[model samples]
Target: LQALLPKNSRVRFTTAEVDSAVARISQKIGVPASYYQFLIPIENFVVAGGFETTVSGSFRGLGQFNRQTWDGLRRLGRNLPAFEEGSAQLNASLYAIGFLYLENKRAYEASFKGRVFTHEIAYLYHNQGAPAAEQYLTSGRLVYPKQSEAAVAAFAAARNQHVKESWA
Candidate 1:
């Protein structure tokens, strides 16, 4: 009876698969995969404006960010809109990760890491007004630590190491 649907159309990914991929990526990238799951709902609501305004009304993280925030953030600063676009891109990456989980039979931990990742990307690119200490108050705080001095050093080290190792 189950054969009527066709094998190609079936969902194959699972939670475990997702977890494993995240783990591998974490090891390779040397960044803790902690914030991805936490940021999922926020990303979704911001980009798509889901039916649920808050994941949980009583929860601070859940209802703290809403569609109205998006609206207000846009009007407050001219550059804020670019951050929104970057956030949307980050959300798309999460969706891709979700699909990977589904195909591989893994868990979906689209929670907060995504927000951190997005914030990190934005910070690295200097998206916000200034590279303030409080910027780390949000997600991606520990991404490189110390407001990017570490990140800058790491980049230089990597480039130097790569140059030294390259024989060709």
Candidate 2:
């Protein structure tokens, strides 16, 4: 756990476990594993060692998926279980989260073409929804409250720190 964690960060899954989970789930989602490789540190830092059944506000699981967003994704003909059930399972939650990223990517690209999505945008999408993230990306201002903004910023910084270390 100590070796897998980022500094003093706390997260439910170890780095190795997260990597494996991302790989397995990415294969199912038909996306490249590196598409989500950056999530490992964000999961450790911002996600904060959550359980499969962890709940805070309307968010759930290690992915911290929102119930509303989960419902929308369910409408995409995905055989997702009920909100509570799907979000409480690691693989199911990751699948939903993966699709969430794709949705955000699509929305962002449609709004503003030729701008590649980054890890920061992915974290913003996970924390503040698609439009808010778009607002931040375009104007450097998040429409969400200060608290939510702080969390998104933390996720981005956590990712950058990990990248710095990885390049060393």
Candidate 3:
């Protein structure tokens, strides 16, 4: 995931640290490590803006969380200190992704027909909301608005590149 990020992304934590966090969080959540792999590049590409830049719209933090999502994280016992702070954001963001994945598990399963849902579908759900993503899944059409479509495409490309590179 870090391999797929832009060269100037605001990644201050060591790769080992982030890897450890991902491992710990995934273990806590009872998902395989690979289940969370797609999130790294997807969020990095679709939502992150250097270290301190808030997402252009309603989302916040490295995970591009909205108020509702952030509050959800709080409810899960993770606290985000500030968007600009790398460690807290990374920790919170990993847990947030895990939380969101669990929150949307049924929709994910339905959309992917019980296979592991693709990052494209996950990002679509993240950007456009569950209802819209469900509609797209049911219709087998790309129904996201233009911006979301573009971002999902970009994330797919990056994620594929990262995968092809053997996660670098």
Candidate 4:
């Protein structure tokens, strides 16, 4: 993951840095590290640091939160001042991603008993929303929408490369 980073990248975070952030955020949010292994990579692939004017807009910062979600976080007392605030963005990203993961996991388990949870599936839920992902998972011929397909594929590819480099 470090090797893939561009020298002049705007948000250049090493794997160790991300790992540390994940660890702290997991503890803070009461989730586990295994859930966020692909989050930063996926968010980096999607919207690294872009804001949204629409209600269900693209995510900003490392986590790439939509406007609605960001506001919801603020309502919950999460202090995300701005995406440009580097440390705050990282913290907010991790916390929101962790929360999303737990929420997706709970919903998925309730509907599909005995299915093992994977980051890939979790990410599908994250990208497409739990109801859509759950429907896809349970469908006889499961099919992901184009955007969801791309998100999951990108996440899987990045995660594979990162693991190959022993970065995660």
Model 3's alpha-carbon lDDT is 0.57
Give a tens-digit lDDT track for model 1, residues 17-123: 43555566545534345533433332223222221222333111211233343343446432333323322232323333332223212111132222222323322
What is the Cα-based TM-score of model 3?
A: 0.59
User: Mind sharing the TM-score for model 1?
Assistant: 0.23
Ordered list by TM-score, greatest first: 2, 4, 3, 1
Give me the runs in candidate 1 sitting further than 4 Å from their true place.
1-14, 45-168
Give the alpha carbon lDDT tens digit for every residue of 37-104 in model 2.
56534443434443223444566776667788899888887667888877766677778878888887
Model 4 per-residue lDDT at 127? 69
**RMSD list, candidates in order:** 17.4, 7.1, 7.7, 8.6
Q: lDDT of each structure?
A: 0.31, 0.64, 0.57, 0.58
lDDT of 2: 0.64
- lDDT measured at residue 3 in model 1 versus the true structure, 0 to 100: 18
| Candidate 2 Cα errors over 4 Å, as ranges | 1-17, 43-53, 146-150, 154-168
Q: How many backbone overlaps does candidate 3 show?
A: 0
Candidate 4 C-alpha error for residue 158, in Å: 16
- Winning model by lDDT: 2
Task: Give the Å error, residue 66, model 3.
Answer: 1.5
Deviation from truth (RMSD, Å), model 4: 8.6
TM agreement with the true structure for every prediction: 0.23, 0.69, 0.59, 0.60
Candidate 3, residues 67-127, lDDT tens digits: the string is: 6656655676655544334223667777676666666666667655535545555666666
Q: Compared with the true structure, what per-residue lDDT tens digits does model 4 show for residues 1-168?
A: 122422112344556667888888888877778767756654564234432111122445566556665565567666566533422355566777777777677887787666555677777667656666766655522353545444757545433432353345
Off by over 4 Å in 3: 1-11, 45-57, 72-88, 110-119, 140-150, 154-168
What is the lDDT ranking, best to worst? 2, 4, 3, 1
